[PDB]
Amino acid sequence: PVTCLKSGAICHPVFCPRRYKQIGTCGLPGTKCCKKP
């Protein structure tokens, strides 16, 4: 459960697509933590 707030990564719903790499999870099972390349 990482907020990804320090990394500045954006959270994505369901799962992280290819444009964004899923580092783990935004915080809840509703969305996932994603980061722009």
From Swiss-Prot:
UniProt effect for mutating residue 19 to A: No impact on fungal cell permeabilization. Impaired antifungal activity
GO cellular component: a single term: extracellular region
Induction: Up-regulated by TNF, IL1B, Gram-negative and Gram-positive bacteria, C.albicans and bacterial lipopolysaccharides (LPS). Up-regulated by inflammation in skin keratinocytes in epidermal tissue.
Region feature (Phosphatidylinositol 4,5-bisphosphate (PIP2) binding): 6-21
Location of this chain's protein in the cell: Secreted
GO MF terms held by the record: CCR6 chemokine receptor binding; chemoattractant activity; phosphatidylinositol-4,5-bisphosphate binding
Quaternary structure note: Monomer. Homodimer.
UniProt protein name: Defensin beta 4A
The species this protein was found in: Homo sapiens
Gene: DEFB4A
